[PDB]
Design a binder for this molecule. Structure first.
Ligand SMILES: *[C@@H]1O[C@H](CO)[C@@H](O[C@@H]2O[C@H](CO)[C@@H](O)[C@H](O)[C@H]2NC(C)=O)[C@H](O)[C@H]1NC(C)=O
Lengths: 973, 106, 50
């Protein structure tokens, strides 16, 4: 369009800017500002109406594009990789289905505008009460295939030991005690259960037996009782993260009782249930006088309402407390024998907890996009401050050898990173600083404390070690004038290292946060002066720079290349402000990326569209980051240490505006010792360059519009089982019992009439239970687990098609079994007491009919409601271990075409092998070649069968089918 | 890692003196001799003579088989005996096939 | 029947219809476990010398 491309680019930038602003802003001037955007939004919509993807389509696509850009790296449109949990967050943030952008924008602004005896025994989950010794219950980091499918949440020991009370009796297995209970009776039962849970938790933590417990209430008792209340809430609600033995049946029965809407019931009785806990706490006064409000007048709610989050917080608190106890034991023992034994005990602990931490972090980070696990754990519980979970749970193989014990080993004596403001305004952390290694420092900063001289010595040694490692790795990374760019990159890393030692570091991630916190007491505003004093005199400056130089020497010697002039310089300049150094790094990166992408444009503009997407994607966030940089600079353009809001001095800039300071710093060429930045556009065009207005008038936004139709690909499956994974469900389901190595001899003219039945007689490897006379107990658990029990429907590539044919055909045979499986469930054409006219179809009807005719087998559960199953791909992967192509992964699962009742699909399979391989044999004695005409007579009866849409079977092979046209239409000798 | 010491097919035995490294620390590695025996439970006493009694006792002195009262038919070997046959009063000897599966002319 | 079907435990009943029968029909049931060894009598004797 004419003159609207500029409008479209302006609207895109303006949308992103306001979205970021409202996210950050989430008072008199705020009302003035919020109405300004309201009027501006109306003006933009009016112009967009003139323009017309739809306005509601564009907002949804923008939300998903931002997500795929920042939280997912590389802006790859791999919707396949994203799991089920994250889809929830995206549809919440970006809107359900599509074309809801107008509503999503509307609601966001509206949100902005509004800105006694019961049979429960004393708890033993974390250890039997004294004089009891053992009985510790471990975290159940497992998921149930039938209920919840894939769930990374780990059940806490406490939840496993929740006082179900009278709701559940363990007599002879598990039987719900509320099969026929009134709504009022259920409320009383739950109230008594909660009261008893509170009482038992109090007596468990008061004796100091809970790992947490090792006002006047027992330490952590309020946390435990609140979390038990949350677990009860999720038990009645039925939204349990993971279903334990008692959880599933109780959830189902409570759903049945209320709906004969559960959320509304609990939202009504939550006040009474929490009053139960308060009354229990008040009754505790008989032991000694607590008013009952210590654990909170209102029931727990908010971000902690999510049970996965609550369980993970409990895991964090418990693990941090245990880590602290191991720290005390190691310190007392060491400061051989007991010391070692404690060290291996800690190592075993961390090895045991690594899997649990990985699973819980994977669930929490994905479900809550952006937020990190360590931040939650550290902010919610002070006891976790002294632990860096990433360092303790590093997955690097060499890490275990380097630190067998972990963060108390000392006590036992890369280019795609986006400029992020996380752990910090508007200032952004360079990728280099995020990469600035602190790994080797942390064990020592843990080990050394309260000693001036030993702290100095060991900290200096490990500082030299980390400096050498960083020099080596950065030099290898940047260098495959190129050296001159790396020269200042080495300088910048050391230049940044000063602030961590000084304490002026702007970034406040876990690493530097703990480092600064411990230095506050090692060398201790005079505390900051004390650190600098070490940085001034023995110098330590020159010593660590010599360590830097030795590191680059080692790197270049490994590369067998000459030493550079830059690092041959021993005297360096005074350190510039951290933001100024980061601002220069940002500007230099902008120079490089802008030049590269613009030359790529001049050359390429066929994958021109990919280049346009890449260039626009790179440029768009840079505009917002530049806005932040300019804002901060205009805040500290002429400010001393006191005048500046932060406790840092910015008196040496001496330039009127940020773009002007860009001049006289990038004006010339890279020098290394003093110059680090150089753009082609030295002039004050960066402000216009950041906005996509000027360019060279080249119109590439049309491709961006051509990128918009990707929203169609953004389809939501809206099902609780994912066929993409990486695999999670594949481990749970077991091998089918009593069906042997199938496809033992198939498509070798074993076809026989009972219609010419293929080797579906045997390649179907149903479990014994369904195929046998025995009926099934419950469809939700046995037909459930038995149809998946035919993971043994994975012996095509497992045993037979492993190398007999190409990889694609093995998976094609599974497509045949799946549709066969589907028609076994409803009206196939086998005529056999186990597959058709059989009782296994009645096994389905019998069980669903037992469930009050909840749904016909041909209404739902027809391989439509739960058509996915595993799609047999687990069996494909179990033995063949061959990765399924994304296009190959949609046929083993559901597709709308049923291929017409097996009358013309099993026929489809005949020519796919049973005729084409004899064909190629013929093309490869003549009597044996002429012995391939008996399939020509057998074509006649099946031709009569099909004769009972297209005229005859031949055309079906010609046009419905893909491999069939290769086959000869008729043998005719 | 298995060292198959013996694979005698009459007295089916598969003694494998496989070494197993103990945990992560060597110098206490365990050595194990897995005497896997498949007693037939149905073969006749004189296995080549079908009309002989049933084996109710199976001696597996491992000393002898390390360096015969055959129990199990070997896969490669054919065990057979002559049989009388009458068609019209003529008693003609002929060889039998007690293990026809592995006795095809080869 | 296929071995995978007989090991499943299905019971096959041989209805025989005849004139002389007192009820004109008789049934016999064959099952996976109709003929089973009711008594396994194994006696492992493991020594160390000849
Ligand atoms: C009984 O066992 C003996 C060996 O312990 C065998 O007897 C002879 O086996 C050879 C092997 O080919 C035959 O040629 C002889 O004819 C057998 N003896 C006689 C008397 O026929 C054989 O395994 C068993 N004996 C028989 C008769 O089957």
């Amino acid at each position: 369009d004419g003159n609207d491309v500029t409008f479209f680019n302006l609207f895109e930038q303006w949308n992103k800017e306001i979205q970021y602003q409202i996210e950050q802003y989430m008072c008199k001037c705020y009302k003035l500002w919020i109405e300004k955007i309201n009027d501006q939004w109306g003006k933009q919509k009016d112009n967009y109406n003139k323009f017309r993807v739809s306005l509601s389509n564009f907002l949804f696509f923008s939300c998903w594009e931002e997500y795929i850009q920042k939280y997912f790296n590389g802006d790859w449109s791999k919707i396949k990789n994203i799991g089920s949990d994250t889809f929830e967050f995206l549809i919440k943030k970006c809107g359900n289905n599509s074309a809801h952008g107008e509503e999503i924008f509307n609601e966001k602004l509206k949100n902005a505008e509004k800105k006694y005896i019961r049979g429960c025994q004393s708890k033993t989950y974390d250890g039997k009460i004294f004089p009891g010794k053992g009985g510790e219950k471990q975290w159940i980091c497992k998921d149930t295939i039938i209920h919840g499918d894939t769930n990374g949440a780990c059940i806490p020991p406490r939840t496993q030991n929740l006082c179900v009370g009278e709701l559940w009796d363990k007599s002879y297995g598990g039987r719900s005690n509320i099969k026929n209970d009134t709504k009022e009776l259920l409320k009383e039962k739950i109230k008594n259960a909660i009261h008893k849970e509170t009482e038992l938790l109090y007596e468990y933590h008061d004796t100091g037996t809970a790992i947490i417990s090792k006002n006047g209430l027992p330490k952590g008792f309020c946390h435990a009782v609140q979390r038990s209340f949350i677990d009860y809430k999720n038990m009645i609600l039925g939204t349990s993260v993971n279903i334990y033995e008692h959880i599933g049946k109780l959830q189902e029965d409570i759903k049945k009782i209320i709906e004969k809407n559960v959320n509304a019931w609990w939202k009504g009785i939550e006040r009474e249930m929490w009053d139960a806990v308060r009354c229990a706490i008040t009754k505790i006064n008989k032991k000694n006088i607590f008013n009952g409000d210590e654990c909170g007048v209102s029931p727990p709610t908010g971000n902690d309402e999510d049970q996965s989050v609550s369980w993970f917080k409990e895991w964090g608190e418990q693990f941090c407390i245990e880590r602290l106890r191991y720290e005390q034991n190691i310190r007392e023992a060491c400061t051989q024998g007991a010391c070692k034994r404690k060290c291996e005990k800690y190592k075993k602990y961390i090895s045991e907890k690594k899997q649990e931490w990985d699973k819980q972090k994977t669930k929490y980070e994905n479900k809550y996009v952006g937020k990190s696990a360590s931040d939650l754990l550290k902010e919610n519980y002070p006891e976790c401050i002294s632990a860096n979970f990433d360092f303790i749970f590093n997955d690097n193989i060499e890490y275990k050898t380097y630190y067998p014990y972990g963060d108390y080993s000392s006590i036992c004596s890369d280019n795609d990173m986006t400029w992020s403001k996380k752990y910090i305004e508007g200032v952004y952390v360079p990728p280099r600083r995020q990469q600035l290694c602190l790994y080797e420092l942390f064990p020592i900063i843990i080990k050394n404390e309260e000693g001036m001289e030993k702290a100095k010595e060991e900290l200096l040694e490990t500082l030299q070690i980390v400096a050498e490692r960083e020099a080596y790795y950065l030099w290898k990374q940047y260098n495959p004038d190129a050296n001159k760019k790396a020269c200042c990159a080495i300088r910048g890393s050391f230049y940044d290292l000063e602030d961590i030692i000084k304490g002026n570091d702007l970034v406040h991630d876990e690493y530097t946060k703990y480092i600064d916190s411990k230095l506050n007491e090692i060398f201790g505003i005079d505390t900051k002066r004390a650190r600098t004093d070490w940085w001034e005199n023995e110098t330590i400056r020159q010593l660590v720079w010599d360590a830097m130089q030795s590191g680059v020497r080692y790197a270049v010697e490994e590369k067998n290349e000459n030493f550079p002039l830059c690092m041959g310089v021993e005297h360096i300049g005074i350190a510039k402000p951290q933001f100024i150094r980061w601002l220069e790094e940002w500007t230099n990166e902008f120079c490089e990326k802008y030049t590269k992408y613009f030359e790529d444009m001049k050359s390429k503009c066929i994958e021109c569209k990919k280049a346009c997407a890449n260039y626009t994607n790179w440029l768009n966030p840079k505009r917002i980051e530049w806005n932040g940089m300019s804002n901060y600079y205009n805040k500290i353009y002429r400010k001393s240490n006191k005048e500046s809001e932060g406790g840092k001095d910015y008196s040496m800039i001496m330039a009127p505006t940020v773009i002007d300071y860009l001049n006289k710093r990038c004006h010339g060429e890279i020098n290394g010792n003093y110059i680090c930045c150089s753009c082609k556009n030295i002039g004050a065009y960066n402000t216009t360059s950041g906005t996509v207005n000027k360019k060279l008038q080249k119109k590439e936004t049309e491709c961006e519009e051509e990128k918009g139709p990707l929203d169609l690909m953004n389809e939501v499956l809206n099902k609780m089982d994912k066929k993409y994974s990486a695999m999670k469900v594949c481990d749970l389901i077991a091998d089918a019992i009593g069906c042997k190595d199938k496809t033992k001899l198939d498509e070798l003219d074993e076809w026989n009439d009972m219609v010419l039945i293929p080797p579906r007689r045997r390649q179907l490897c149903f479990s014994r239970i369904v195929r046998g006379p025995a009926n099934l107990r419950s469809l939700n658990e046995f037909k459930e687990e038995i149809l998946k029990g035919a993971q043994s429907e994975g012996k095509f590539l497992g045993n037979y098609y492993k190398e007999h044919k190409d990889k694609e055909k093995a998976l094609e045979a599974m497509k045949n079994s799946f549709y066969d499986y589907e028609d076994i469930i409803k009206g196939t054409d086998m005529l056999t007491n186990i597959e058709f006219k059989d009782i296994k179809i009645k096994l389905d009807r019998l069980l669903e009919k037992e469930t009050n005719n909840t749904k016909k087998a041909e209404d739902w559960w027809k391989t439509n409601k739960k058509s996915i199953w595993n799609a047999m791909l687990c069996g494909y992967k179990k033995s063949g271990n061959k990765i399924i192509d994304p296009s190959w992964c949609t046929i083993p699962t559901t597709e709308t075409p049923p291929q017409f009742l097996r009358w013309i699909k099993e026929w489809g399979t005949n020519v796919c092998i049973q005729k084409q391989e004899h064909k190629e044999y013929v093309k490869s004695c003549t009597s044996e070649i002429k012995k391939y005409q008996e399939w020509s007579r057998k074509r006649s009866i099946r031709w009569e069968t099909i004769s009972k849409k297209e005229p005859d079977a031949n055309t079906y092979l010609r046009e419905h089918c893909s491999k069939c046209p290769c086959g000869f239409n008729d043998m005719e000798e | 890692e298995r060292i198959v010491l013996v694979d005698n097919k009459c007295k089916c035995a598969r003694i494998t003196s496989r070494i197993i490294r103990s945990s992560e620390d060597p110098n206490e590695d365990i050595v194990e001799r897995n005497i896997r025996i498949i007693v037939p439970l149905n073969n006749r006493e004189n296995i080549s003579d079908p009309t002989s009694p049933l084996r109710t006792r199976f001696v597996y002195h491992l000393s002898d088989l390390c360096k015969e009262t055959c129990y199990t038919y070997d896969r490669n070997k054919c065990y057979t005996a002559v049989v009388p046959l009458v068609y019209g009063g003529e008693t003609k000897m002929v060889e039998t096939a007690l293990t026809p599966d592995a006795c095809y002319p080869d | 029947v296929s071995e995978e079907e007989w090991n499943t435990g299905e019971t096959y009943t041989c209805v025989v219809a005849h004139e002389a029968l007192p009820n004109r029909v008789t049934e016999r049931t064959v099952d996976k476990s109709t003929g089973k060894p009711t008594l396994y009598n194994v006696s492992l004797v493991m020594s160390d010398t000849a």
